[PDB]
Amino acid sequence: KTLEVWIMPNSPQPAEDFKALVAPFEKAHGVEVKVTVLDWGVAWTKITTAATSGVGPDLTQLGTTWVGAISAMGVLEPVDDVLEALGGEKAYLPAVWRTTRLEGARQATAVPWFSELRAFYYRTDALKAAGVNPAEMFASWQGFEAGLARLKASSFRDPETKAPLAPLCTPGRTPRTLHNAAPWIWGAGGEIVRQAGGRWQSALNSPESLEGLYFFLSLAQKGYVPAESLEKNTAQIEADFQAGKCAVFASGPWMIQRAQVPEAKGGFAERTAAKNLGVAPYPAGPKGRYTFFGGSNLALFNFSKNKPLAKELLKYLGGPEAQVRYAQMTGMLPALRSAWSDPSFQQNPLLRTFIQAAQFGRTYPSLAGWGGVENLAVQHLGMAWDLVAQGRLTREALKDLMDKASAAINQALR
């Protein structure tokens, strides 16, 4: 007997970490667990192929944003019995509870595995040379621009690159997701889709949503983001934060874990970045503080022939002990609220800011169509980055792009 599980690269040796995690399960149950690791760029397609063909694992990891769309295909086993065993609705942040199901659906089709949310890493050394107070830089949108202007005029140079630092690094390539932009949209009072009149519509083109996007993209148009970042994707901008080219960069909590790991083992501990590492939450916008709150869930294909064992492995992976163990390996946060108290998370000062930032965690609605919305958003957003790369993003050019993304998104939804 072999359980087949699919995971994404959640830690530097993802398959080994996962196998070490489930070994007590294997012994207690006298079964073997076979792990496949799919990269984040293709995971969506091979998972969707598995759902359409009925050929695949027992369990798969899903990004919290995917659960809506796979559940709607009617390929996932109810796990209301697993969630019940784990403590039920009371044992999660509503931010996590909303991702166990298709929005509006009767029954849970996903168990929360881990959580993650976005904040700003900075270089403690570089802000201190600019004479920038991080409590003021990251307090509001004026604070931030003031932070970046001072960071741009600083004579500071990285010890190892003996070169000045990019003030903000963010990617300008067509994004995979609105993960980077969403907090700007939200903090301006805006949103990506809106529920009204018994329908979801695009709000990408609202005054609020454009205010947020333009504020964010125009930072790049004012020389806070160097041209070279406009041509890179998330993973490139992250190597560059690690190799000492950027003073400020928005990411998830895993980069705290990787900073303690040697470059050989898939981290950056030897880098200066790692020795001089700060975290601050997104600054408050005109209409609130928000950050993108996400993570991954586990779901059982209803065409699995190992559904009993696969539920005990769900109950295993979702329960306090394996919750603690895997968050430590991956540098993510447990999904189960009780596991957040562990001193491993509480007494790590950088991970503490992510934990306090989580009060302002916001999520995407779990709509069957959510992938289709996000894909059209990001396509249009990519055409906005290309105008920034010309110095040609104006308010009206951005309105025009988002009125076109809203026309296509509306069609998709209706």
Ligand SMILES: OC[C@H]1O[C@@H](O[C@H]2[C@H](O)[C@@H](O)[C@H](O[C@H]3[C@H](O)[C@@H](O)[C@H](O[C@H]4[C@H](O)[C@@H](O)[C@H](O[C@H]5[C@H](O)[C@@H](O)[C@H](O)O[C@@H]5CO)O[C@@H]4CO)O[C@@H]3CO)O[C@@H]2CO)[C@H](O)[C@@H](O)[C@@H]1O
């Ligand atoms: O929208 C989908 C879904 O997204 C979730 O968010 C995901 C996000 O989509 C992913 O892109 C992101 O991926 C990061 C991994 O979590 C994290 O493990 C990884 O960290 C290390 C990695 O562990 C390490 O092996 C890697 O090493 C490279 C070296 O640095 C290079 O020198 C060498 O050449 O190549 C190796 C690679 O073999 O480096 C990285 C970076 O330090 O970083 C990934 C990239 O950012 O994970 C997010 C969280 O899971 C979101 O949560 C869901 O809600 C959403 O639905």
Ligand SMILES: [Cl-]
């Ligand atoms: Cl973006």
